[PDB]
Write a protein that binds this ligand. Sequence first.
Ligand SMILES: O=C1O[C@H](CO)[C@@H](O)[C@H](O)[C@H]1O
Ligand SMILES: [Cl-]
Ligand SMILES: [Cl-]
Ligand code: NA
Length: 473
Amino acid sequence: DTVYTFPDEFKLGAATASYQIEGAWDENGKGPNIWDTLTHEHPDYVVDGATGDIADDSYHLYKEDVKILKELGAQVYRFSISWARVLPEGHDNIVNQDGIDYYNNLINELLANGIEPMVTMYHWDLPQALQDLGGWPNLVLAKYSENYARVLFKNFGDRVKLWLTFNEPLTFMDGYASEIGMAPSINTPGIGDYLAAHTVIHAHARIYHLYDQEFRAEQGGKVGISLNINWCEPATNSAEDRASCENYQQFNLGLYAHPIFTEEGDYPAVLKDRVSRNSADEGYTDSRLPQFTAEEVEYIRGTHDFLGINFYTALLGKSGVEGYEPSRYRDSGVILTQDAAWPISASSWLKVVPWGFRKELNWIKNEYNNPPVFITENGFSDYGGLNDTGRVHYYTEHLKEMLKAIHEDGVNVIGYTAWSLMDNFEWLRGYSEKFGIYAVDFEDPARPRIPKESAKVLAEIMNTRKIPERFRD
Ligand SMILES: O=C1O[C@H](CO)[C@@H](O)[C@H](O)[C@H]1O
Ligand SMILES: [Cl-]
Ligand SMILES: [Cl-]
Ligand code: NA
């Protein structure tokens, strides 16, 4: 039963994000963010015209969140801080004491209940005042991000020892690649999304160096970043299809992880080279991919204490090129599909491919020299219901695959937080797609959280520190 047992030091818990759960979008001095803007000005972009104005009301109900975390037996709670709740103007001239108090109250409540906080600084909710300068494509945001992090480290770092600078820049960069998509819903594919990535990488590095310079000696914590990646399985066993899947890994994970997690640093060569060639062929004087100087490469590489991974699903990849010119997908040189045989979810993009998790963990181990990996998200959507057998099966299979990666393959996985503690605002899908292990009634002003079968099974896993026999192969 070794392969079914969690290592003694391994941390298990659950995860949320600020805009998805908090509500109180304009309460007690909080400034507006790009998701306030999207859901207020462009309800046509969101299922049901939903907003995060109330969501789970975790701004008011944070003690209820801690209660269910304690019931679950979570060792760690991953949550994010709302930038505009703390710095309503984005810049650090005004610090909102209400925001400071709120996150202190949550942190203190967690610790009093024996649950460790893990804090994501940026989970997609950029202050609108910073978007008005251009947002992530504008490199000035790297210094603004440093200043925001300083406020967080100063106020919370005495009690928070696990930090993630960013969540899924691969996803939020796409807010600069569509007029109707993720906030801020700007249509600059193949140009502005790359600029956003570049700024994020710079920002991450500044934040890490800040921690080293101003806080680490005193606080003794760890700073990472949460990167999402799908497994990409070759459609056939050919060398050509394998090449396309390597392209996928480099264009999705490597975009962020090669600069930070390798000894060499910089973007992956294939990323630089394919974008350079495509840009030339299309008549640009300059490559659409921004460049790091040698000094920047050195500054950025090594800025990590662990790697956060969000893992959900897999794709098939075959040799070829498709997508619009210009775009990151077209530049990446892979044709992506899903296998019809894979079990479905309530999300078009999410198919159940648990063995892909093990493959991805091995890819990461080999590419980045077995960094400590914390699984900061993994989970499954349905449309509702407490007898969530699909979600239970999703978790038990993915945890089994992860445990094989640890025990059989030697991957240094150090923790795992399920996405999500509770049903919440699922971005452009509104409240229509449910990812929680606790259900929430969004028509009940009290927003009660009630356990699904998956919450019960995860509690059993957390308590026993093993995969129960009935879920074993
Ligand atoms: O990777 C993610 O997947 C989740 C499910 O789509 C989403 O809700 C989180 O905010 C996001 O970080
Ligand atoms: Cl084949
Ligand atoms: Cl049994
Ligand atoms: Na302060």
